[PDB]
């Protein structure tokens, strides 16, 4: 089995620069195909027989290599490209693909949009109370999220949830959910989401108490 | 127009049996050699085979992982490719997609958008959709969120639109979390004009078919 290596695994460029990616094969191969996988969606075909570009693929990607060197090049890089790109052989049996290379793009930073939302009434009749804040339109992703319960810092009883970079503005979004029993919840009041990231002069908090909404 | 779409990916318990099928249209079906790779959640893509076209009779190849377990065959009459899975196993979670070979073991030029198989001993689970509104409008901000919150369903996927499609701009669905109890739980929010609050209607549409269920939940 011919093992294909990509490098590097993870790449993160400005707009207009270029992204240069290699696949080296173990052994010598004829030819090395480049798919590209957008979030949510199935692989398609981007370059075939080394430097041929699928119809419809932008002249912004490139393909080269020969043997046991290959490289995929994009000279401009743009949002739409955010995206996992593999490169593939069929020169022995069977054909595999390389690990796979993670493209991101590098935009300006911009602050997140806070909110924060309580359990609702028919889930509260239940026996359980999830707790909701949402991190909107942020760039960097790393974002610090932490949940104050009458001022008291909670750790362990919340799951946080990251969506794939967007082509349309370049940034993240953050889901972190707080769930507690109902009579735990009912013993309280301040519930509030404390957020620390690069677009923030200083953590802001959006909250709410219970019994109030 | 070349269109893969599969079908058949579900809940199957370990050691179990799953068929796959993929209808395919807009090519001559029998002139083209087609495969099946599958993706593990967050791995790589692993080719799993192929059946060639009418001149071969239907000649298969597999890879050493499926050989004697995955069949591979094709039926003519309907454009339709199958994969028979036996024996599954937890490994055998994945995405499986069809793909079409522009040539003889040259290289996928086209793919289905792939169906999910889950191999679990556990059980089928609808979810329930809980609405994500804020204690109060705030006349001061301009632009405030709502959200549907789909949780513990068994197993993935889960489809949310809005307004039945009609809502589309500013919707984020998260990816879903593995909750401790083994059931996930995910968020689809969307952002709108405070200006709107009170005025018109947001509803959730969030299909769960693995348990047949559809839910259209009001959030204002």
């Known amino acids: 089995q011919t093992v294909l290596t990509q490098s590097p695994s993870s790449l993160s460029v400005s707009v207009g620069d270029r992204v240069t990616i290699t696949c080296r094969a173990s052994?010598?191969?004829?030819?090395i195909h480049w798919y590209q996988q957008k979030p949510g969606l199935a692989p398609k075909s981007l370059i075939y027989?080394?430097?041929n570009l699928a119809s419809g693929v932008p002249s912004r990607f490139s393909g080269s290599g020969s043997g046991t060197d290959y490289t995929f090049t994009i000279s401009s890089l743009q949002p739409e490209d955010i995206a996992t790109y593999y490169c593939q052989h069929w020169s022995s049996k069977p054909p595999t693909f390389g690990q796979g290379t993670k493209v991101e793009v590098k935009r300006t930073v911009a602050a997140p949009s806070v909110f924060i939302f309580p359990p609702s009434d028919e889930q509260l009749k239940s026996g359980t109370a999830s707790v909701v804040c949402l991190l909107n339109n942020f760039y960097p992703r790393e974002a610090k999220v932490q949940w104050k319960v009458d001022n008291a810092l909670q750790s362990g009883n919340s799951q946080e949830s990251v969506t794939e970079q967007d082509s349309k503005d370049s940034t993240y979004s953050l889901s972190s959910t707080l769930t507690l029993s109902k009579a735990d919840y009912e013993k309280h009041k301040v519930y509030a989401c404390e957020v620390t990231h690069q677009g923030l002069s200083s953590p802001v908090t959006k909250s709410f108490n219970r019994g109030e909404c | 127009e070349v269109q893969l779409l599969e079908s058949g990916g579900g809940l199957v318990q370990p050691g179990g049996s799953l068929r796959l099928s993929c209808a395919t249209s807009g090519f001559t079906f029998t002139d083209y050699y087609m495969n099946w790779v599958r993706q593990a959640p967050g791995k790589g893509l692993e080719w799993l085979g192929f059946?060639?076209?009418?001149?071969?009779?239907?000649?298969?190849e597999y890879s050493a992982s499926v050989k004697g377990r995955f069949t591979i065959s094709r039926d003519k009459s309907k454009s339709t490719l199958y994969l028979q899975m036996n024996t599954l196993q937890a490994e055998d979670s994945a995405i499986y997609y069809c793909?079409?070979?522009?040539?003889?073991?040259?290289?996928?030029?086209?793919w289905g958008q792939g169906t999910l198989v889950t191999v679990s001993s556990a059980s089928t689970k609808g979810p329930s959709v809980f609405p994500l509104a804020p204690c109060s409008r705030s006349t001061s901000e301009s632009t405030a969120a709502l959200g549907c919150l789909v949780k513990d369903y068994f197993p993935e996927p889960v489809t949310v639109s809005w307004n039945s499609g009609a809502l589309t701009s500013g919707v984020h669905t998260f990816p879903a979390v593995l909750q401790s109890s083994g059931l996930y739980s995910l968020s689809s929010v969307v952002t709108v004009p405070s200006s709107s609050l009170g005025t018109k209607t947001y509803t959730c549409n969030v299909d769960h078919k693995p348990s047949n269920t559809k839910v259209d939940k009001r959030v204002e």
């Open positions: 052994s010598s191969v004829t030819y």
């Open positions: 059946i060639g076209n009418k001149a071969n009779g239907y000649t298969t």
């Open positions: 793909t079409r070979d522009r040539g003889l073991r040259f290289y996928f030029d086209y």
């Open positions: 027989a080394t430097s």
